[PDB]
Structure formats: C-alpha cells, structure tokens
Design an enzyme around this catalytic site. Sequence first.
Site, PDB file in Angstrom:
ATOM      1  N   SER A   1     -79.905  11.696  40.514  1.00 26.99           N
ATOM      2  CA  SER A   1     -79.093  12.776  41.035  1.00 26.99           C
ATOM      3  C   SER A   1     -77.645  12.405  40.827  1.00 26.99           C
ATOM      4  CB  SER A   1     -79.361  12.996  42.520  1.00 26.99           C
ATOM      5  OG  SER A   1     -78.556  12.067  43.230  1.00 26.99           O
ATOM      6  N   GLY A   2     -76.845  13.400  40.468  1.00 28.76           N
ATOM      7  CA  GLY A   2     -75.405  13.243  40.394  1.00 28.76           C
ATOM      8  C   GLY A   2     -74.692  14.345  41.158  1.00 28.76           C
ATOM      9  N   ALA A   3     -73.656  14.907  40.533  1.00 25.06           N
ATOM     10  CA  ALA A   3     -72.800  15.913  41.155  1.00 25.06           C
ATOM     11  C   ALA A   3     -73.191  17.344  40.821  1.00 25.06           C
ATOM     12  CB  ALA A   3     -71.340  15.693  40.733  1.00 25.06           C
TER      13      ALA A   3
ATOM     14  N   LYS B   1     -83.491  19.753  35.495  1.00 24.37           N
ATOM     15  CA  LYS B   1     -82.250  19.518  36.260  1.00 24.37           C
ATOM     16  C   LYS B   1     -82.051  20.727  37.173  1.00 24.37           C
ATOM     17  CE  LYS B   1     -78.199  17.714  35.833  1.00 24.37           C
ATOM     18  NZ  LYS B   1     -78.021  16.747  34.727  1.00 24.37           N
TER      19      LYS B   1
ATOM     20  N   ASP C   1     -67.240  16.069  30.301  1.00 26.65           N
ATOM     21  CA  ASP C   1     -67.804  15.022  31.159  1.00 26.65           C
ATOM     22  C   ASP C   1     -68.555  13.968  30.347  1.00 26.65           C
ATOM     23  OD1 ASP C   1     -68.415  13.635  33.459  1.00 26.65           O
ATOM     24  OD2 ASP C   1     -70.299  14.775  33.753  1.00 26.65           O
TER      25      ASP C   1
ATOM     26  N   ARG D   1     -73.126   7.373  31.319  1.00 26.68           N
ATOM     27  CA  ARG D   1     -74.182   8.020  32.087  1.00 26.68           C
ATOM     28  C   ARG D   1     -74.575   9.384  31.525  1.00 26.68           C
ATOM     29  NH1 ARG D   1     -69.498   8.684  34.732  1.00 26.68           N
ATOM     30  NH2 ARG D   1     -68.839  10.867  35.029  1.00 26.68           N
ATOM     31  N   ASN D   2     -73.833   9.943  30.580  1.00 23.66           N
ATOM     32  CA  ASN D   2     -74.223  11.225  30.005  1.00 23.66           C
ATOM     33  C   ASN D   2     -74.661  11.073  28.550  1.00 23.66           C
ATOM     34  OD1 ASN D   2     -74.012  12.881  32.279  1.00 23.66           O
ATOM     35  ND2 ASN D   2     -71.796  13.177  31.984  1.00 23.66           N
TER      36      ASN D   2
ATOM     37  N   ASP E   1     -75.662  16.833  29.061  1.00 28.55           N
ATOM     38  CA  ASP E   1     -74.869  17.491  30.098  1.00 28.55           C
ATOM     39  C   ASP E   1     -73.668  18.234  29.541  1.00 28.55           C
ATOM     40  OD1 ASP E   1     -76.444  17.129  32.322  1.00 28.55           O
ATOM     41  OD2 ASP E   1     -75.406  15.329  33.034  1.00 28.55           O
TER      42      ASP E   1
END
Length: 293
Positions: free
Chosen positions: A19-21, A43, A135, A139-140, A153
């Site tokens: 989980s992120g933002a 997602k 972004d 992590r992406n 993302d």
Amino acid sequence: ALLRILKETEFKKIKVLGSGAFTVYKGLWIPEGEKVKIPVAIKELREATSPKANKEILDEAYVMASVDNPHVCRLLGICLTSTVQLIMQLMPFGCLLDYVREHKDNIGSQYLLNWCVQIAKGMNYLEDRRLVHRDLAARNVLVKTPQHVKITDFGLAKLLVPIKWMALESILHRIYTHQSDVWSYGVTVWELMTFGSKPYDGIPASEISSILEKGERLPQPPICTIDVYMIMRKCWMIDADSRPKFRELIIEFSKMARDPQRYLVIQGDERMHLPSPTDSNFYRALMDEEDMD
Ligand SMILES: Nc1ncnc2c1ncn2[C@@H]1O[C@H](COP(=O)(O)OP(=O)(O)NP(=O)(O)O)[C@@H](O)[C@H]1O
Ligand SMILES: [Mg+2]
C-alpha cells in the site's frame, strides 16, 4: 479497445501485496464461462464520485491503457464502483527498490547499468507520447524478471507528495515536465547504485527545497565512478533544459553497460554476470514472452 471494463463479480481480491498513497492486491480474474482463475494485480484507490470522477478517471485510464512499451506497465482493466480499481499484470518479483535491497550482495554492474538503460527506455517512450510520469522512483519500477524491469504507476499522480524525488521547479511551483521526470530518474539511479538507500535520510521533507537551492545534492554512492555521478549530477541541474534528455541517457548507460566494471566498482563483480542464453530463454518462455523483453 485497450481497456477492459470489469464487473465486480468477475475478479476477486485475494492477498494484500502493499500500500502507498494512491492498496495493491494479488487478485484472481475469472473469465466468464470458464473454470480457470487467472492471477492479476489489482490496485484500489481511495474514495470516488460518480457525479464526476468517472470519465475524468476513465478518459485518463484509456491513456494509461494505450502505453505499449516493453519497459512501461500498461493498465489492462478498470472497475468503477464506490472505490476505483485498476487491474494490471501481476509482477511476482515486486519493485526494484526492495529487489536490490534484498539482493545487495548480489547485484552486479551488468544488471545495474542495464536497469538504468531499461528505465530510460521506458521513460523515453513516455516522452515520445507526450506523457509525464510525475512519480518516478525505484518503488515505481517493477521487476518482471531480474533481467527485465518495467516502470509502473504512470498517470496515477495527475489524476489524484514525494518531495525527495521531485525537481526544484516541481516542489516550488508545481511544474511537471519531461525534464522534471529526469530529476526523479536521477534519484532512482541513486537508489539503485546505493542498493536502496533512502534519499536525504532523516532530513524533513519540509527542508529539501532549501538544501537544493544552497546546492546540497545526493552524495556520490561508493560504487560509482564520476562518469556515472556526473550524469546523476546533471539530472539535478537547476535549469531544466540543462538536464540530459532521456534519449541521451539511453545511449550513455548503453555505452557503459558495454564495459561494466570500468564504470561501477563492485566487489566480486567478476562472478555476478548476467544469465546465460539458456537461462535467459527459459526465463522468457515461462515468465516473459514479450516481443522485446
Ligand atoms: N503489478 C504489480 N505486481 C506486483 N506488485 C505490485 C504491482 N504494483 C504494485 N506492486 C507492489 O505493491 C506495493 C504497493 O504499491 P503502491 O501502492 O503503488 O505504493 P508504492 O509504489 O510503494 N509508492 P507510490 O506508488 O509512490 O504511492 C509495492 O510494494 C509495489 O511494488
Ligand atoms: Mg507504486
């Protein structure tokens, strides 16, 4: 035709992956009329409004369903309910950040430089399409196989705050261009060459914009020669059109991936080579049949 509208009743969330933002689920697509359950990644975002956030989400999702590149993850389907659920190919290896972090003692120069090329190839495609990531981070970037990374993302950020991966013109004025993506790209390269260190560790996000203006930049990672560090340094120039272009970045890391140890100094680098063709073909036949993996 590139975006499949799904009914709730034809896919199920199974286990949380993270989980992120923007929460990511390992899920199961059940095509109608079949007895197979097909693993997918789901997602799910926060709340949503029917009287509004429908086409705004759907129209921009068609954009995300149009990305066709070996190094950029494509959005495959959407489910528009109370929440918003985006379906994409499950990548069982996870993000490159945790990957190089769990494999610190095992990432050679050949991989690291090749990952840069691949990320730059992904990012360069998005520019050719006139699209801004907003972004980019380690992590992406997802790991399809250890030999094949894909950016993820895309276009999330705009339709919905990562200060330490943003260019100064984006922190101060909220300007997001392809040259600001280059900044973030440079930070991603720093995460990769430090084997996953947190940028500006401990410094409050509130204070990043000031240290940038007085000229703090991320430190040269141990294994990096100045050629690579220079390239990193050029990504974080204050003047955005002084920053390298993604297309220039492909050629350079490609040049460096042709003689890896002269540009990165890893202990025992001589023993952490790429997979033989045999291993590479077996990997692709089971996990990565993409046209140009
Ligand atoms: N398609 C996918 N397959 C497998 N794992 C995935 C996939 N997409 C995302 N993940 C993982 O799910 C977790 C949540 O990702 P996400 O919710 O986008 O937050 P984040 O990437 O860590 N940060 P951010 O995207 O900037 O908000 C991360 O650990 C991702 O690596
Ligand atoms: Mg993500």
